[PDB]
C-alpha cells in the first residue's frame, strides 16, 4: 500500500491537488517537508496585500457536512516571513483517491501565502502556539501519521522525486519508494533533530575545492533555494563570484550575473559515503527584472531546498528517523515497493 501523488512544478514551489470535505473540494497545495500542518484557503479569506491567494482552489466549510470547527485559533509564520491565520478544524482529506476521515486541518481566513500548504513533517513541529508563545491546542496526528493510523500506509514515510528542473511534474509517494528512479543504492542517513528533517552534511565541493561543514541541513521541499550560515556561504560565494547585496535593514541576498557560466557541478557529501551531485545551472535564479539571485543564500538555519532536492531521490522515514538518499535518475520507468 503506497500512495503516489503528482507534484506540480510551480516554479518556486511544488504543489499537489488534494480534496477536502464531504463534497471533495479541490485544493492545490504546497507539499512541504519543512512544516507539519495542513491548512486551506477559506473561500471568504482576505488575502494579504498584493497576494492572489484564491487562485489555487478554496475551501468552503459550510458546504462540507463533515467539517468540524474546533475551538481554537490557528497561526503560523514561515521562514520567509509569510503568515497564515484562521481556525483549527477537522474534515475528510482525499489524496489520489485515498480518504482519511477526521483529519485535523486549519481553515485559513487571512494569509500572505499564495495557496494552502500540506505540511508533512514531524508532529513536534506543528504550529500550535500563539504569538505570546503559549501552546493553545495539543499536538495532534498530522496527515502522514493519520495515513498510517487509518491503515493506508504501513510506515510514516514518503519518497520525494521533484524531477528535473524543466519538468512540469514530479511525484511524492506516501508509504513507498520508486526503485527505478535512482542510481546506486539508497544510503540511510540519521535524522539529527527531533523536530526537523535534518541530516548531517559533512562537506561541499565547489569549483575544485572542498569545504568542510559538519552540521545539520534541513531537507526542505518547501524551500526554493539553498541556505547556509553567513561565513560558510561567503566561502562558497568567493569561488562562485556571487555578490552580497543589502535588500532591507537586516536582509542580505547573494546576486549573480544572469549570464554567468553554469557548467560544472556542486557535490554534497553526507554520512556513510552518500553523495549528491547538483549541476551548477541550479545556482542562477531569474528574478522578474533581469537580475538573478545566486542559488545559495545566507541564513543561521541551513536548508537544502528544491535546487538541491531535484538531484536526489529521497526516502524520508519519520518512524525510523532516517532519510535515505541516492543520486536521482530521471525516468518514466517505475518500480515501486511498499515501505
Amino acid at each position: 500500500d503506497s500512495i503516489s501523488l503528482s507534484l506540480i512544478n510551480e516554479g518556486p514551489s511544488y504543489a499537489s491537488k488534494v480534496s477536502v470535505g464531504s463534497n471533495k473540494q479541490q485544493q492545490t497545495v504546497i507539499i512541504d517537508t519543512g512544516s507539519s500542518d495542513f491548512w486551506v484557503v477559506d473561500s471568504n479569506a482576505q488575502c494579504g496585500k498584493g497576494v492572489d491567494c484564491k487562485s489555487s482552489g478554496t475551501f468552503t466549510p459550510s458546504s462540507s457536512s463533515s467539517y468540524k470547527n474546533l475551538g481554537a485559533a490557528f497561526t503560523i509564520r514561515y521562514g520567509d516571513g509569510s503568515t497564515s491565520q484562521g481556525t483549527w478544524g477537522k474534515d475528510t482529506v482525499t489524496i489520489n483517491g485515498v480518504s482519511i476521515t477526521g483529519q485535523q486541518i486549519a481553515d485559513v481566513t487571512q494569509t500572505s501565502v499564495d495557496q494552502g500548504i500540506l505540511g508533512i513533517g514531524y508532529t513536534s513541529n506543528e504550529a500550535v502556539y500563539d504569538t505570546s508563545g503559549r501552546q493553545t491546542t495539543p499536538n495532534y496526528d498530522n496527515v502522514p501519521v493519520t495515513l498510517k493510523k487509518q491503515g493506508k500506509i504501513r510506515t510514516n514515510a514518503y519518497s520525494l522525486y521533484l524531477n528535473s528542473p524543466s519538468a512540469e511534474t514530479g511525484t511524492i509517494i506516501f508509504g513507498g519508494v520508486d526503485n527505478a528512479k535512482y542510481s546506486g543504492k539508497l544510503v540511510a542517513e540519521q535524522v539529527t533533530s527531533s523536530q526537523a528533517l535534518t541530516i548531517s552534511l559533512a562537506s561541499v565541493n565547489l569549483k575544485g575545492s572542498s569545504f568542510s561543514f559538519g552540521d545539520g541541513a534541513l531537507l526542505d521541499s518547501g524551500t526554493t533555494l539553498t541556505y547556509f550560515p553567513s561565513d560558510f556561504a561567503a566561502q562558497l560565494a568567493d569561488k562562485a563570484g556571487a555578490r552580497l547585496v543589502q535588500v532591507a535593514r537586516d536582509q542580505y541576498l547573494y546576486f549573480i550575473d544572469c549570464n554567468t557560466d553554469t557548467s560544472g557541478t556542486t557535490v554534497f557529501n553526507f554520512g556513510n559515503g552518500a553523495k549528491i551531485t547538483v549541476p551548477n545551472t541550479e545556482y542562477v535564479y531569474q528574478n522578474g527584472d533581469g537580475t538573478c539571485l545566486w542559488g545559495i543564500q545566507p541564513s543561521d538555519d541551513t536548508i537544502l531546498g528544491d535546487n538541491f532536492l531535484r538531484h536526489a531521490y529521497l526516502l524520508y522515514n519519520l518512524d525510523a528517523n532516517t532519510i535515505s538518499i541516492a543520486q536521482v535518475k530521471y525516468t518514466t520507468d517505475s518500480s515501486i515497493s511498499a515501505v
Binding site: R77, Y78, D220, G222
Partner: peptide, 5 residues
C-alpha cells in the same frame, strides 16, 4: 519561498 522554524 521558505516553508517552519
Amino acid at each position: 519561498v521558505v516553508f517552519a522554524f
